[PDB]
Design a protein around this ligand. Structure first.
Ligand SMILES: [Zn+2]
Lengths: 121, 191, 171, 148, 52, 67
RNA sequence: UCAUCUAGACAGCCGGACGGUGGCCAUGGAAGUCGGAAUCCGCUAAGGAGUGUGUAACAACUCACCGGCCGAAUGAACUAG
């Protein structure tokens, strides 16, 4: 049961990595569920946002390491609270939308991985 | 269930030096030195690399492996007490009669005297254990600070000063008068 | 006592209505043949409608340990009668042979639950062929990599009533 | 400048809210009654926007209200205060229309989902001639296009 | 009146305790069993009765 | 200065530890500990001295400094 | 006997704990939390048509759920020496 839900997560992640060349790693701190929900709706058409336990994710990437070897570079960046954005749009347009939306007294993009290349941005 | 090997670690900072013959611990640091007899607890010590010391017990019962973590906490308290020091802040609490606290000297022994606690004519004197320094703090009303190296000596002196001001033959939920410890910390806290 | 394991095979006495009964077999830990056959008939009277007057024993054979110098982990399933009821227990013992394992089992039950030989029923004993199927911590403790431990506080018993120096408990 | 939202059974406290805005209770009630007309009979959320002189009343769309209205209902005085349990026909088109009416207001996840949520909102309504409300929603893909 | 914070600090030691129902011992507020031997370390505890 | 402890090492029991049989039928020969049964007994073997491979209580042997 | 567990468990800190929806009756009110029934979806990593505090009703706070630190066993009920 728990394992079954977990197995599904592993599979979807693999599919997402294959589906979108552009990957954005986003760090969320003090972001409300409502704040997150709005961002998801704005980016529903061009982006996929994935949230998961890091321990779960690292194992998955290692499991899928033989295929898509360049994704290994993303693993150091995975540490800390993180989210994964998979998008057709290459870079800035997605980034601009994420930072701007729902800033209240705050989503940040920690790193960008595109086509096997990592950008601090 | 006779745990055949359980083992804890203590970290030794750069400033201190710890000397352990049989079960007598001497910790020497910047603020001074402290010692401790531990011949009642039956553990074994082992220096690893001059900043780590493991303490272990072999074939121990449940009470014995409880005592292992206890003695680790005691020697670690000694190390952090000789590095950062220990400071207990206590506050004076009264309704009508103000508590008047001074420091007197019968035969040069540094007594703390307490006057007018709930208006009585009796004068409460608590002695001061050695190594504990007492300062009546400014800029906060009615606050006393006890500082030292030994957490045992500082907290015991603070507890003696708290217990000397107990109210008799009254409802103590209404007669809340006394001297109560409000803060426990280090002399160089947030170092 | 010091236990031995026997197979005991018996059957009912053959009648004209039914010759060749079904030859039941059981494994008994006992001190000797007499106690082994008594325990065999005890458990067959608990299982089937037979008794010693109505049946016979066709074979009794001692089964000694196949590898008496291999260190095994055994899982043992046991019934015992307490002072208020009957309970099932599973205990696992790291030991070198089956008879010694059930000897330490009988000592363990008599020590920890005050259960006697008349109260303990041995359901089964089986070697656990794989590690990480071991479920008790007191035996899983001894399965770690490079297990080593000291023996503190050596006490040497003396032959003389007087010793001429203060003894040492270094080991 | 100031917006106040209240759930009001139509045809009609209000005064306490009105005093802060310095608006006559009767005037507000009349305006609300006119707004409720649209369906009315049943409780509906009403939005009042205050211009610092007068308050304008509009009826905000609510799933329960729209669903209750869709179930055909004989007008009820409510003097009886009966249970007034609501029984409804499948009304698949009406629910799809309701989902469209919501138009993913407040970000419903999908057009089909908005309809599914609308179906859930019919906890009160039977919502089907022969089925539990939204029981078959997962089963049938029909009407997904209609909601969009 | 003492002060609100000072009443809180004094009531931390005087009023925010628990009482064993068997032997009337004054106990920590989050305790589960009495620390006394004479009641047999019982778990019959009640909050200390406040004013107001 | 540097931190000083008294190490107080003694004669660990593990595989390859050479022991001397104190009492029994061997009673004075050498053996090597092959495996550890539990806290109180070990499987030893003494094949040069003629000690048969056996499980033995740790109170019947003395551990030597040889490993 | 049930459960959780190196795909990260139980304590401890820190963050989120959301929309349809103030779900349906009933009340002068009761919007998760006076009660009666039902108790379903979306977004989800995750969030009960609600565990309490909580207000006239709100608002607000906290929960059981998911996440970072921790890295390994732990929780509940019961039995008997
Ligand atoms: Zn008690």
């Amino acid at each position: 049961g728990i394992r079954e839900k977990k197995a599904e997560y592993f599979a979807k992640l693999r599919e997402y990595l294959e589906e979108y060349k552009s990957l954005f790693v986003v760090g969320v701190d003090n972001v409300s569920s409502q704040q997150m929900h709005e961002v998801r709706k704005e980016l529903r058409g061009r982006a996929v946002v994935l949230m998961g336990k890091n321990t779960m994710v690292r194992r998955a990437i290692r499991g899928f390491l033989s295929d898509l070897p360049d994704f290994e570079k993303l693993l150091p960046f995975v540490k800390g609270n993180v989210g994964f954005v998979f998008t057709n749009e290459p870079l800035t347009e997605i980034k601009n939308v994420i930072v701007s939306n729902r800033v209240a007294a705050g989503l940040t993009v920690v790193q960008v991985y595109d086509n096997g290349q990592v950008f601090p941005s | 269930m006779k745990y055949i090997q359980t083992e804890q670690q203590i970290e030794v900072p750069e400033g201190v030096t710890v000397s352990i013959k049989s079960r007598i611990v001497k910790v020497v640091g910047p603020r001074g030195t402290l010692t401790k007899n531990l011949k009642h607890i039956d553990v074994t010590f082992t220096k690893v690399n001059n900043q780590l010391i493991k303490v272990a017990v072999h074939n121990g019962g449940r009470k014995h492996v409880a005592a292992l973590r206890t003695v680790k906490s005691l020697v670690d308290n000694m190390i952090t007490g000789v590095t950062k020091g220990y400071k207990y802040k206590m506050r004076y609490v009264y309704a009508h009669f103000p508590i008047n606290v001074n420091i007197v000297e019968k035969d040069g022994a540094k007594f703390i005297e307490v006057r007018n606690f709930l208006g009585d004519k009796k004068i409460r004197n608590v002695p001061v254990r050695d190594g504990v320094t007492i300062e009546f703090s400014t800029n906060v009303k009615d606050e006393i600070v006890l500082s030292g190296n030994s957490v045992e000596d500082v907290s015991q002196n603070a507890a003696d000063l708290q217990q000397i001001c107990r109210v008799r033959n009254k409802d103590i939920r209404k007669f809340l008068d006394g001297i109560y410890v409000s803060h426990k910390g280090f002399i160089t806290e947030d170092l | 006592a010091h236990f031995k394991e026997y197979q005991v095979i018996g059957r009912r006495l053959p009648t004209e209505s039914v010759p060749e009964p079904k030859l039941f077999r059981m494994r008994i830990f006992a001190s000797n043949e007499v106690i082994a056959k008594s325990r065999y008939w005890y458990f067959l009277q608990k299982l089937h409608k037979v008794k010693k007057a109505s049946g016979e024993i066709v074979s009794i054979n001692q089964i000694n340990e196949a590898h008496p110098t291999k260190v095994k982990n055994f899982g043992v399933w046991v019934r015992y009668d307490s002072r208020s009821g009957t309970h099932n227990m599973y205990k696992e013992i790291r030991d070198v042979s089956r008879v010694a394992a059930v000897e330490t089992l009988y000592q363990d039950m008599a020590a920890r639950h005050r259960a006697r030989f008349r109260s303990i029923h041995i359901l089964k004993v089986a070697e656990i062929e794989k590690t990480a199927d071991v479920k008790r911590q007191y035996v899983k403790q001894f399965l770690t990599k490079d297990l080593k431990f000291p023996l503190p506080h050596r006490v040497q018993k003396s032959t003389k009533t007087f010793s001429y120096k203060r003894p040492s408990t270094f080991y | 400048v100031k917006y106040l939202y209240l759930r009001a059974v139509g045809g009609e406290l209000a005064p306490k809210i009105g005093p802060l805005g310095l608006s006559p209770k009767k005037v507000g009630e009349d305006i609300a009654k006119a707004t409720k007309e649209f369906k009315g009979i049943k409780v509906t959320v009403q939005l009042k926007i205050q211009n610092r002189q007068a308050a304008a009343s509009v009826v905000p769309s609510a799933s329960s209200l729209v669903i209750t209205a869709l179930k055909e209902p004989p007008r009820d005085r409510k003097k009886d205060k009966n249970v007034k349990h609501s029984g409804n026909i499948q009304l698949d088109e009406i629910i799809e229309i309701a989902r469209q009416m919501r138009d993913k207001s407040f970000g419903r996840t999908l057009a089909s989902v908005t309809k599914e949520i609308l179906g859930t909102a019919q906890s009160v309504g039977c919502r089907v001639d022969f089925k539990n409300p939204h029981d078959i929603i997962e089963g049938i893909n029909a009407g997904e296009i209609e909601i969009p | 009146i003492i002060e609100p914070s000072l009443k809180a600090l004094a009531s931390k030691y005087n009023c925010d305790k628990s009482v064993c129902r068997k032997c009337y011992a004054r106990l920590p507020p989050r305790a589960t069993n009495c620390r006394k031997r004479k009641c047999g370390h019982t778990n019959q505890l009640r909050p200390k009765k406040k004013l107001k | 200065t540097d931190s000083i402890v008294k190490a107080s090492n003694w004669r660990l029991v593990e595989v390859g530890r050479v022991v001397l049989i104190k009492k029994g039928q061997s009673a004075g020969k050498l053996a090597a500990i092959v495996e550890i049964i539990d806290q109180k007994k070990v499987l030893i073997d003494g094949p040069k001295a003629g000690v048969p491979r056996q499980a033995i209580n740790l109170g019947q042997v003395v551990l030597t400094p040889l490993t």
